[PDB]
């Protein structure tokens with residue numbers, strides 16, 4: 130285990146003292162890593178690991194907050210949500226939960242937080258904030274903004290009238306680890322706060338000339354919408370001359386495939402060719418650089434058996450990629466599994482799917498208005514400036530929601546620095 134910073138240790142201390150806490154910090158400050166250390170330090174009984182999204186839940190071995198709550202979409206009236214939470218399996222999960230971990234809190238809208246808080250009280254019959262559950266919450270409100278299952282403009286989670294009562298303590302992680310380069314760290318920090326000076330703008334524009342690929346590997350284009358990702362990956366695959374090689378997943382419940390898809394980074398049908406640009410979506414070997422996010426290209430298929438792909442990675446290593454398995458925790462503690470190769474096509478990927486990840490071979494076009502925090506998320510995935518190529522950069526792409534700046538300014542009002 131790595132040596133926790135003083136900041137990271139302080140959060141761990143609070144959690145083990147039984148304090149409900151929100152902890153926050155820039156991209157790559159080790160929030161999710163610290164969640165893993167927290168989960169290891171707690172009894173597994175009574176501790177529930179969630180995140181706002183399926184992609185983020187994977188990073189910590191958890192489930193989605195949606196799946197844990199078991200209140201359907203959460204759009205139904207509170208009384209109907211309570212009844213849903215009273216269902217077998219669901220109910221027990223609420224009753225037995227003493228500590229609830231939530232990563233990537235920035236995607237949870239205030240109305241949903243309010244709903245969960247009320248459900249917690251109703252189901253557990255405990256007249257205390259959040260049913261008396263110890264909340265352990267982290268993320269960055271200057272990253273991806275709240276989504277909604279409804280049609281109204283969402284409020285940030287901190288706008289809930291229950292936020293401060295439910296998470297009375299706030300701590301910060303301030304040392305970025307993802308990037309090693311101070312120039313790049315300082316550049317990302319300016320973007321995160323919406324402060325694009327002439328110098329910042331010039332620096333990002335200069336990346337347009339970066340050749341980020343090496344030896345037949347090309348940059349993954351980060352896109353705002355999955356439609357555009359799917360179309361790009363399919364068209365680039367189709368244009369390759371080789372025969373198609375197919376790898377069909379085996380699911381424990383094929384019928385529930387769609388529930389699996391939301392919490393699992395691999396598809397039912399994987400199609401590959403010589404030359405296919407692929408991303409490894411599971412940590413295989415940290416030492417050999419075979420980690421989640423690693424980019425490579427298919428350099429052959431084995432002659433024998435299933436004809437598994439041989440993949441040359443940007444790092445250097447060339448390796449035959451074997452089947453792996455994901456076991457997802459759905460509603461009411463139901464478990465579903467998928468066996469598949471841990472590969473996705475990677476000429477393109479959505480910014481939402483990169484949430485929480487480190488990447489190192491990325492291109493993005495930043496000349497349009499984006500959602501608050503979305504340009505920052507995209508840029509802050511890259512380990513290094515030289516693995517990033519930004520096209521058509523314009524500060525219009527970089528927006529911070531004023532509500533979030535006000536939140537952060539209020540949060541630090543009494544602090545030393």
Ligand SMILES: Nc1ncnc2c1ncn2[C@@H]1O[C@H](COP(=O)(O)OP(=O)(O)NP(=O)(O)O)[C@@H](O)[C@H]1O
Pocket residue numbers: 131132133134137154155156157158159160161162163269306307484485486
């Ligand atoms: N104490 C530490 N010492 C050294 N490296 C660390 C430490 N804590 C975390 N890291 C590394 O920091 C990197 C980023 O960690 P991660 O947990 O993804 O950050 P994050 O704050 O969750 N990122 P994001 O989800 O993008 O906001 C990982 O490669 C960790 O190994």
Ligand SMILES: CC(=O)Nc1ccc(-c2csc(N)n2)cc1
Pocket residue numbers: 183184187358390391392393394395408410473474475477478479482483
């Ligand atoms: C839970 C979940 O859906 N995870 C996930 C993560 C990454 C990707 C991915 C990588 S490259 C690409 N085109 N898409 C897809 C899915």
Ligand SMILES: CC(=O)Nc1ccc(-c2csc(N)n2)cc1
Pocket residue numbers: 287288292293532535536539
């Ligand atoms: C609760 C807390 O710690 N701070 C906080 C910050 C901002 C807002 C907000 C933005 S505009 C609006 N109507 N509400 C609410 C609360």
Ligand SMILES: [Mg+2]
Pocket residue numbers: 160161162485
């Ligand atoms: Mg994270």
